[PDB]
């Protein structure tokens, strides 16, 4: 039901994001902010998904060696120069997107553009640096050196996307890590780090014209384009199970259950964001001002009552989106004996969206969704991530006002329609690590996606 518009005057009072396309095809996006610090970086449309099976892991390796010296600097000189500017260089690598962003002061904006351009365009992939990083990457590759939340994040993709490259991990298999060489990385740079796939984001005390001029000068020699990516069909969602039963790792079990989600540009994506908010998160060790027994979240409240002890030591919803697919589900960390109750309750919660979801819960979720999104845009790095991630995902940045406008239209009935179409009687994928005697078969859990009542 429609209860009015929550857009306010303050939402319109934000500096505009100016996006211009350079002649080579590189987009330059900037937003001015009244700050003494800035964030300037390069958000690229590269990642593990766009690697082949034999080369999986090259992108992650390159990201770890790109700041270890250039053809015009050395590692010590580069690190010294950044420190003198009072700046720090960051970088991450994902399945579909990558970034290389610097957090500096106002006077270091243009100087940092020069540093980042040199690293991206003229990386000196010294053999010694590669070999040392090979050891570090290999140690990280060991699952003993990986958290259980990182392990289940990767295994969810492995189980759900057996047929496509989205199932590949970022770090890569140990066989590939053992064999990556400079030539692999040089090829990856040539094919993927091209102007058409890069966005230069500058947030802070910045002027669009000046940033654009510097960008054109420093990125003049970048490869203009690479061949269009091979057209593929929708990533097939495999309803499978990948459970690592281990009764020798303590009492806590980690279970992740996934449904097929929606791509970034889907009209239903904001509905899935709201549904993710309704699921929410809960930790027995950080319950908040409201206790679990008296929580407005229905999943949390019913869970907190089970056996007078609570069946969720921790849980969170997740909504992962890619260009042509997505994953929607929940992650649980709970006592071994509580797993059956925990998965049963969260699946009952997701199934409830399709039958009996109250306006009260939706409206609370809208406010906490907006309180999480807006607070993320507080600092320059948060804004820069939002600009770079949103231009890659959508080709434009959605304004806070537009997000609120579209969220106003979504109500309990809209959530019910989307859930009924996509989540009710739907195929699921379960992945887990730990003592999981209580975890039932996939078919048993999949029947809990529909109700005999109502």
């Amino acid at each position: 039901y429609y209860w009015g518009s929550t857009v306010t005057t303050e939402m319109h009072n934000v500096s505009p994001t100016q996006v211009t396309r350079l002649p080579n095809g590189m987009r330059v996006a900037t937003q001015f902010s009244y700050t003494d610090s800035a964030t300037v970086g390069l958000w690229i449309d590269a990642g593990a998904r766009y690697e082949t099976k034999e080369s999986n892991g090259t992108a992650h390796f390159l990201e770890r060696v790109l700041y270890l010296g250039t053809k015009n600097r050395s590692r010590d000189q580069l690190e010294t120069e950044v420190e003198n500017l009072g700046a720090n260089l960051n970088s991450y690598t994902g399945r579909e997107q990558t970034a290389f962003y610097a957090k500096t002061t106002k006077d270091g904006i243009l100087p940092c553009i020069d540093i980042l351009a040199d690293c991206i365009l003229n990386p000196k992939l010294d053999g010694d640096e590669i070999e040392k990083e090979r050891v570090r990457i290999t140690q990280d590759l060991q699952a003993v050196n990986q958290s259980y939340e990182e392990l289940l994040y990767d295994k969810v993709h492995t189980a759900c996307y057996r047929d496509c490259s989205l199932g590949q991990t970022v770090i890569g298999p140990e066989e590939n890590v053992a064999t990556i060489k400079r030539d692999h990385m040089v090829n990856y740079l040539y094919n993927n780090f091209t102007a058409d796939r890069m966005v230069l984001v500058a947030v802070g005390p910045v002027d669009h014209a000046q940033i654009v001029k510097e960008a054109e000068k420093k990125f003049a020699n970048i490869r203009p384009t690479a061949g269009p990516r091979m057209l593929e069909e929708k990533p097939y969602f495999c309803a499978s199970e990948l459970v690592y039963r281990n009764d020798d790792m303590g009492p806590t079990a980690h279970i992740a259950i996934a449904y097929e989600g929606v791509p970034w540009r889907s009209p239903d994506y904001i509905t899935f964001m709201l549904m993710n908010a309704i699921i929410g998160s809960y930790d027995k060790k950080n319950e908040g001002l409201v206790p679990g027994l008296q929580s407005a979240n229905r999943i949390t409240q019913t869970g907190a009552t089970r056996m007078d002890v609570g069946c969720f030591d921790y849980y969170t919803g997740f909504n992962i989106a890619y260009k042509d697919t997505g994953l929607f589900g929940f992650y649980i960390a709970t006592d071994e004996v509580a797993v059956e109750h925990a998965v049963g309750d969260l699946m009952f919660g997701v199934t409830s969206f399709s039958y009996s979801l109250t306006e009260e819960e939706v409206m609370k979720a809208k406010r906490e969704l907006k309180t999480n999104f807006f607070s993320g845009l507080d600092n320059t790095t948060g804004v820069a991530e939002d600009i770079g991630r949103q231009i890659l995902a959508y080709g434009r940045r959605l304004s806070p006002a537009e997000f609120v406008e579209r969220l106003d239209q979504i109500d309990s009935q809209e959530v019910q329609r989307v859930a009924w179409n996509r989540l009710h009687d739907a195929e699921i994928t379960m992945t887990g690590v730990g003592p999981l005697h209580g975890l039932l078969q996939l078919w048993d859990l999949r029947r809990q996606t529909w109700w005999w009542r109502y």
Binding site: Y2, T8, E10, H12, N13, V14, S15, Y34, D36, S37, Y67, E79, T80, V82, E83, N84, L85, G86, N88, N90, S91, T105, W264, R265, S266, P267, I270, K285, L289, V290, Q294, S295, A296, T358, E359, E360, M363, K364, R367, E368, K370, T371, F374, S375, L377, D378, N379, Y394, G395, R396, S399, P400, A401, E402, R406, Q409, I410, D411, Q413, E414
Partner: protein
């Protein structure tokens, strides 16, 4: 400016009598129940997100943020900045921490935190927390050594409600016997949350050893044995009457209109009498130094900390000692930091790069109104403790001189840290509130940058010499079966 309070000028907001009927008209609209509704299909159900749908947007109105200072007639100071964000951060700071407790009042500051957001004169406990929840607000209360903070993060539109709820914790709290008894659980949770953070636990050990049974040393958390005898509503009320007063309180608001915040805060205190301000015993900290070796049977690693007394926040040594902390910097093997992340600090280059057995080495600089602690924190395997202490002592002996390149790098990194930390709104709120409580004044990030630029090598040498003349505080936590004795540390530092 109509009033000067502790070195800062405030504009005086006058109390006005308004009818409940007229103020109700200005309260933000919200519903708890939705009994029916007007169906309206999602108009954008078929519109992909890549297609803009909003048209005729009002032109933006950008104003350079400025910090504005006001004071009510009851003596409550209000300090607000508006960065024009869409989420606000309202906080209430009271100058009543653990340092003001008498030995018979042990833990009472923590107890006040535990009973926060319980029943008030005009709102039950359940109704306060369900309102904060339905409006999508997060927050809580934290009791420190010098102050206690009540914070709520909210969508700016709901500030009128949040201001009321926060202020009710200090204005008319009903410390009902059976609601207080339900808060005894939080003590055990607090101890577990502290001990989980090894760095903060070792910091608590440092302060207790540094200042023996006095102000800063006073335990931050209440114990769950003999302290529960006076964990009562009556005892809490007496403590609040002694220390909680409008003159010792400061309401900070980030991303809020100052005039609106002042109005609603005025309306909240207009028809009620705040706790009167009374004199209290305020004794300067007594630094004794000393040593404590705490054993954690489950930990195989040894955490060693050697600290020294600093004059504190109100001294002229504050900025120079902070440059010294950045100059010595430090890092940890667990972290893999890229360029500009402390890879060229003295500790990283002299300790981490040259001693593979050192798990982590860092410099620490706690700062309080009239005292502080500076020193090094180094960790490693238990059997390595004798060598870890030697490494720490050797670094302390190198503070006699500093190269020009190191000083410049430290100053630039410190300025970058100041500006980058400031942009976080929660950090800014806590910085402002803790500044006013400590000093009665706010030093802006730019002004601190100006001070940092004026630090010379002579200042660093002078400050370091003063620190090294103090009796060291020597804390070992974890596997302590191989650590040196305190006299070994003392004799090594006796030369300095």
């Amino acid at each position: 400016g109509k009033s000067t309070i502790q070195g800062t000028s405030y504009n005086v907001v006058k109390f006005q009598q308004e009818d409940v009927s007229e103020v109700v008209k200005e309260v933000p609209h919200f519903q708890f129940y939705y009994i029916g509704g007007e169906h309206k299909d999602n108009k954008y159900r078929d519109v992909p997100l890549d297609i803009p749908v909003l048209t005729e947007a009002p032109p933006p109105q950008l104003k350079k943020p400025e910090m504005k200072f006001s004071v009510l007639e009851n003596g409550m100071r209000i300090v607000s900045v508006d960065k024009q964000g869409l989420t606000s951060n309202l906080g209430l700071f009271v100058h009543a921490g653990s340092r003001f407790e008498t030995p018979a009042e042990e833990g009472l500051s923590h107890m006040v935190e535990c009973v926060a957001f319980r029943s008030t004169a005009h709102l039950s406990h359940l109704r306060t927390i369900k309102t904060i929840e339905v409006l999508g607000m997060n927050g809580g209360c934290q009791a420190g050594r010098e102050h206690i903070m009540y914070n709520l993060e909210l969508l700016r539109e709901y500030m009128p409600v949040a201001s009321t709820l926060v202020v009710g914790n200090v204005l008319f709290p009903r410390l009902l016997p059976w609601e207080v008894n339900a808060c005894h659980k939080e003590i055990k949770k607090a101890h577990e949350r502290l001990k989980a953070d090894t760095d903060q636990y070792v910091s608590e050990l440092l302060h207790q050893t540094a200042y023996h049974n006095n102000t800063l040393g006073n335990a931050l958390l209440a114990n769950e044995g003999r302290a529960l005898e006076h964990f009562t509503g009556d005892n809490i009320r007496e403590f609040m009457m002694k220390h909680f007063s409008a003159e010792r309180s400061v309401f900070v608001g980030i991303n809020v209109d100052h005039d609106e915040l002042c109005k609603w805060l005025m309306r909240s205190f207009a028809e009620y009498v705040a706790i009167p301000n009374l004199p209290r015993d305020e004794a300067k900290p007594v630094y004794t130094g000393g040593y404590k070796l705490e054993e954690n049977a489950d930990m195989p690693v040894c955490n060693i900390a050697i600290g020294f007394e600093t004059e504190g926040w109100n001294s002229a040594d504050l900025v120079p000692v902070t440059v010294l902390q950045t100059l010595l910097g430090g890092g940890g093997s667990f972290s893999t930091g890229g360029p500009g992340k402390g890879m060229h600090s003295r500790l990283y280059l002299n300790v981490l790069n040259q001693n593979p057995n050192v798990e982590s080495c860092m410099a620490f600089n706690t700062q309080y109104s009239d005292s502080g602690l500076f020193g090094m924190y180094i960790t490693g395997f238990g059997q390595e403790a004798p060598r870890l202490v030697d490494i720490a002592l050797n670094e302390l002996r190198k503070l006699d001189s500093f190269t020009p390149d190191e000083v410049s790098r430290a100053k630039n990194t410190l300025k970058g840290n100041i500006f980058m930390n400031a942009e976080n709104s929660k950090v800014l709120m806590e910085d402002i509130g803790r500044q006013i409580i400590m000093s009665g004044k706010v030093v802006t990030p730019e002004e601190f940058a100006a001070r940092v630029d004026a630090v010379t090598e002579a200042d660093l040498k002078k400050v370091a010499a003063k620190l090294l003349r103090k009796n060291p505080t020597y804390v070992v936590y974890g596997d302590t079966k191989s650590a040196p004795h305190y006299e070994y540390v003392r004799t090594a530092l006796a030369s300095l």
